[PDB]
Design a protein around this motif. Structure first.
Motif, PDB file in Angstrom:
ATOM      1  N   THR E  81       0.809  -1.222   0.000  1.00  0.00           N
ATOM      2  CA  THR E  81       0.000   0.000   0.000  1.00  0.00           C
ATOM      3  C   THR E  81       0.850   1.286   0.000  1.00  0.00           C
ATOM      4  O   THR E  81       1.699   1.424  -0.887  1.00  0.00           O
ATOM      5  CB  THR E  81      -1.157  -0.019   1.039  1.00  0.00           C
ATOM      6  N   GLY E  82       0.679   2.220   0.941  1.00  0.00           N
ATOM      7  CA  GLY E  82       1.468   3.466   1.028  1.00  0.00           C
ATOM      8  C   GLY E  82       2.872   3.266   1.627  1.00  0.00           C
ATOM      9  O   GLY E  82       3.713   4.161   1.533  1.00  0.00           O
ATOM     10  N   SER E  83       3.144   2.113   2.242  1.00  0.00           N
ATOM     11  CA  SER E  83       4.395   1.821   2.947  1.00  0.00           C
ATOM     12  C   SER E  83       5.470   1.274   2.002  1.00  0.00           C
ATOM     13  O   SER E  83       5.222   0.373   1.189  1.00  0.00           O
ATOM     14  CB  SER E  83       4.165   0.834   4.099  1.00  0.00           C
ATOM     15  N   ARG E  84       6.701   1.757   2.190  1.00  0.00           N
ATOM     16  CA  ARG E  84       7.942   1.218   1.614  1.00  0.00           C
ATOM     17  C   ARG E  84       8.887   0.807   2.733  1.00  0.00           C
ATOM     18  O   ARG E  84       8.845   1.388   3.817  1.00  0.00           O
ATOM     19  CB  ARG E  84       8.630   2.268   0.718  1.00  0.00           C
ATOM     20  N   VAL E  85       9.779  -0.143   2.474  1.00  0.00           N
ATOM     21  CA  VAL E  85      10.849  -0.536   3.406  1.00  0.00           C
ATOM     22  C   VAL E  85      12.154  -0.812   2.667  1.00  0.00           C
ATOM     23  O   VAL E  85      12.139  -1.248   1.515  1.00  0.00           O
ATOM     24  CB  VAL E  85      10.455  -1.756   4.279  1.00  0.00           C
ATOM     25  N   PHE E  86      13.276  -0.607   3.354  1.00  0.00           N
ATOM     26  CA  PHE E  86      14.603  -1.002   2.894  1.00  0.00           C
ATOM     27  C   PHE E  86      15.328  -1.772   4.002  1.00  0.00           C
ATOM     28  O   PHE E  86      15.514  -1.254   5.113  1.00  0.00           O
ATOM     29  CB  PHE E  86      15.407   0.228   2.435  1.00  0.00           C
TER      30      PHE E  86
END
Lengths: 129, 123, 80, 205, 150
Positions: E81-86
């Motif tokens: 959805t609106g969330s990104r992660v690295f």
RNA sequence: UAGCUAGUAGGUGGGGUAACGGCUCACCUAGGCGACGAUCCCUAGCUGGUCUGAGAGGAUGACCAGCCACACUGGAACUG
RNA sequence: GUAUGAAGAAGGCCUUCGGGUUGUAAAGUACUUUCAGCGGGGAGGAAGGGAGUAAAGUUAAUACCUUUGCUCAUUGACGUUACCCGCAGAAGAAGCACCGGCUAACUCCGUGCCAGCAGCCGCGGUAAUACGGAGGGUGCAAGCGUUAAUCGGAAUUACUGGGCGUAAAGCGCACGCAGGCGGUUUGUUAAGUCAGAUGUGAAAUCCCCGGGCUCAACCUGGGAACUGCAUCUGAUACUGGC
RNA sequence: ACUAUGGUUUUUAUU
């Protein structure tokens, strides 16, 4: 309209995978064919053909496995307006040894594996695993 | 944004200003003090609270809050003004010190004496 | 080796000088991207054989004019 | 800094025995171990849950008499050569001069040992040291000055050391009051009263 | 082995005219402390029942993490959805560091040598689905040595 | 603040300098700049460093190294 | 200061009235001077110069001007000093901020929307952990706090890494003077790029490892960081020019 | 055919 010879190449290798299409066509160029040979040598495609004389056309035979595509990671990690270059000692590692970067050297298109084998740097043009 | 933008100039950001410029990068400055006024509270509170009007060493004239109990403040006797806001006082960004200069003293505390400025007994 | 540059002549009617256009690649030292920049050089010429639009090779040696040390060496293809 | 106050109140509010106010003159230590502190410390915890690793950190600080900022230094040196912050931390705390003097038995507590060090009565390699945090080296010799060797304070502590746990990593002679520290303390003979799973995210809030 | 963890709790702010409702939503994770993780979310009456209603899901979606020498092979990105992660491999104790909503996911897999950060339009109950999407994107030694041809 | 030059711009002949140039003094012409921000204004010593941050990035160039400018305020000339 | 000390005292505070706690803390009694005060001794910074004694110097090898070993006897601001040895005695040495939540510590009495409290949300009308009083806790510590200046958090300036139908930003809509971007064959140019040789991001210093003074500040012996970088002799695969 | 209005505000923590 058309600024770079491979901006329409990577998308046509990435797309058509969900419908599992065994082939794709595109307009042909010296760099597209030089890349198609190393994508066959590294097992990412099964065949490539050129057809024509004054404006040639390129057909690639795409590779599949049981219920899946094989080219699951393909990116440029560079852009034609702001290109990426590296020294012979600084060619990028991919998946900590499980992938390869593609370099355009003063002796043609090769993997960073083979550019480091020769002692050369150049322009970075693709990342595959 | 394009590759041809955001270069040769760093673009805008926020500034502190400062919000308390009359102190000239100090935490506190003294001023003469001329008047004291009774102010209205905000709707959640029932009170009538005191504020003083003070001209500083630099000619700037501010309104400051009077915390603690009671006042006997005078005209031109001087008091010390500190940076720090209590939003419950109208038009004020400033606070008064009691333990300093000719200001209204305070007595009888066991806890907190570095505020109000209260000496402890020995004899 | 002394440093040399090449460019096309843009003005020649002067009796002891010529004006040359220089177009060379320059970047921002920490934001990258090499771009071509157009500049103009004033060059000393007592042979007076050059034509306009013809490519000349020029170098920076010692002052000959007001804030100007550039002088002429040779033509590259002598096009008329 | 230093505490300077009622000493048994430390062992009570840490729920841990520090060898304070007990000895050969008390019965069953008479230090009320496992009796709860005050009237609010007698009630159930509300578990923030950060409070349980703060309980375990205070315990390992208080055993070795170490300050917070100084324990934030031991937690940084413990991580070296991938030595585990839950293991090498104990080998550095157990390697302190004010703990080694207590293990050699020249004092009854780490606090008595710290006061013998700070009052210039202790030597290492024949040289005087007043630093209680001093990190003891392998095959190095610890000794005591004759003005303290004259006192019952240190001989009563060596007579108490014969009825106590003897460590494997160091040797000592009670006739001369001189000890050899031999090799780094290790997990196999060092025994810790804390959960190593509570010291894994310290100072990262 | 078993590891169960609670990250955050939320109360529905509704006043059901009798008063503020006792309806709660919990964010949880489950693993083994050696190499497995699953992600829990659920809504029930009071926290002691909402924690079980959330761990219900974490037990039904548990997977094994592809590790190479006790950490990840490569830096990898995740999306939901609106969330990104690295997420990237690091060294012993240099992964944590990371805040409670990453710390819980890493500690039920038993790792302290992997770094993670959320970016973009984050939402407390969606960042875990992006964290797990980066572990569904994480490469495993399942096809890499069987695909160069021939 | 989008406009600026007219020793400015290209030639001739002299003077002066440790040396070089419109450095500088006289005549023959009408050319020469400007947006990598000229014109006109407002500020400011510089670097290694140092403070901060994972670093990029930001603040500060004063306490330890090393340059530079100045002598109430501004000039002018000699010695070497 | 240390150890011992229990009708767990005298005095306080809470008190599901069942009892708990300040607290081994104190007194009582024993033990010892780190440091500070006063007393006695005392290290290195001190070379050259002076005197003895030697010389294939250059001439005249005991002048003068020079040369190299070995002895005696000395130059001290710092200093009322490092360091060491004495004398009586716990003697001379403790505060201030924080306890509603975030962010470590909990309650009662009094006050009762009043008077104060003031990061923000708020706390105040009958047990108010938020005000006044007080006991018990907590983080620091001869210091403790309150504010201020700059950074981090800051993707809220997006090199790492952003956004533009609307919720905020696509020119109201057009031509094209400067700028940019743009097939294929065969040459050419050396700005961007590259190779062979050479130099190099200095000292101090963060980070990492050993010494000199106890750890160490400070000074020093090595690493690593410093995502850096100059001059030639040559190359034209690749970009940009022609 | 045929109308104008009414300031301000509230209710538990817990396994």
């Amino acid at each position: 309209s058309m600024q770079d010879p491979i901006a329409d190449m990577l998308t046509r290798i990435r797309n058509g995978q969900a419908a599992n299409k065994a082939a794709v066509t595109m307009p042909s160029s010296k760099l597209k064919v030089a890349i198609a040979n190393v994508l066959k040598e590294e097992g990412f495609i099964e065949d490539f053909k050129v057809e024509g004389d004054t404006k040639p056309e390129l057909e690639l035979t795409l590779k599949y496995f049981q219920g899946k595509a094989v080219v699951e990671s393909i990116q440029r990690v560079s852009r034609p307006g702001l290109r990426i270059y590296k020294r012979k000692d600084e060619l990028p590692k991919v998946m900590a040894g499980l992938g390869i970067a593609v370099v355009s050297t003063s002796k043609g298109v090769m993997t960073d594996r083979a550019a480091r084998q020769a002692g050369l740097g150049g322009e970075i043009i693709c990342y595959v695993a | 944004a394009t590759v041809n933008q955001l270069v040769r100039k760093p673009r805008a950001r926020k500034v502190a200003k400062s919000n308390v410029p009359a102190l000239e990068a100090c935490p506190q400055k003294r001023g003469v003090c001329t008047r004291v006024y009774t102010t209205t509270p905000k709707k959640p509170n029932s009170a009538l609270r005191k504020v003083c009007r003070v001209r500083l060493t630099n000619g700037f004239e501010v309104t400051s809050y009077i915390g603690g109990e009671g006042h006997n403040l005078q005209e031109h006797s001087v008091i010390l003004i500190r940076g720090g806001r209590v939003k419950d006082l109208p038009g004020v960004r400033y606070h008064t010190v009691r333990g300093a200069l000719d200001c209204s003293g305070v007595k009888d505390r066991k806890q907190a004496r570095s505020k109000y400025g209260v000496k402890r007994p020995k004899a | 080796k002394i440093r040399t540059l090449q460019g096309r002549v843009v003005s020649d009617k002067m009796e002891k000088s010529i004006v040359v256009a220089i177009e060379r690649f320059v970047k921002h030292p920490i934001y990258g991207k090499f771009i071509k920049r157009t500049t103009k050089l004033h060059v000393h010429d007592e042979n007076n054989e050059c034509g306009i639009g013809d490519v000349v090779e020029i170098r920076e040696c010692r002052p000959l004019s007001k804030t100007k040390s550039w002088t002429l060496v040779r033509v590259v293809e002598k096009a008329v | 800094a230093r505490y300077l106050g009622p000493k048994l109140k430390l062992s009570r509010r840490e729920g841990t025995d520090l060898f304070l106010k007990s000895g050969v003159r008390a019965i069953d230590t008479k230090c009320k171990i496992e009796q709860a502190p005050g009237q609010h410390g007698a009630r159930k915890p509300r578990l923030s849950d950060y409070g349980v690793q703060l309980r375990e950190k205070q315990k390992v600080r208080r055993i070795y008499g170490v300050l917070e900022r100084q324990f934030r230094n031991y937690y940084k040196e413990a991580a070296r050569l991938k030595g585990n912050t839950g293991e090498n931390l104990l080998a550095l705390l157990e390697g302190r001069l004010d703990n080694v003097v207590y293990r050699m038995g020249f004092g009854a507590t780490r606090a008595e040992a710290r006061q013998l060090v700070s009052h210039k009565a202790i030597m290492v390699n024949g040289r005087v040291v007043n630093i209680a945090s001093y990190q003891v080296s392998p095959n190095d010799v610890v000794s005591i000055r004759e003005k303290a060797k004259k006192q019952s304070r240190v001989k009563a502590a060596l007579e108490l050391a014969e009825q106590r746990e003897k460590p494997t990593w160091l040797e000592v002679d009670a006739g001369k009051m001189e000890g050899t520290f031999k090799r780094k303390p290790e997990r196999s003979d060092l025994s810790a009263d804390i959960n190593e799973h509570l010291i894994v995210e310290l100072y990262s809030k | 082995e078993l590891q169960e963890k609670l990250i955050a709790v939320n109360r529905v702010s509704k006043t059901v005219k009798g008063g503020r409702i006792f309806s709660f939503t919990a964010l949880t994770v489950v693993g083994d402390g050696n190499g497995r993780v699953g992600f829990g979310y659920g809504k029930a009456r009071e926290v002691p029942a909402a924690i079980q209603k959330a761990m219900e899901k974490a037990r039904r979606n548990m997977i094994n993490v592809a590790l190479n020498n006790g950490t990840l092979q490569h830096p990898v990105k995740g999306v939901h959805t609106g969330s990104r992660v690295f997420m990237q491999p690091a060294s012993e104790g240099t992964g944590i560091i990371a805040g409670g909503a990453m710390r819980a996911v890493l500690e039920v897999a038993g790792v302290h040598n992997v770094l993670a950060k959320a970016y973009g339009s984050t939402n407390p109950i969606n960042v875990v689905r992006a964290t797990i999407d980066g572990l569904e994107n994480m490469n495993s030694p399942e096809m890499v040595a069987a695909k160069r041809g021939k």
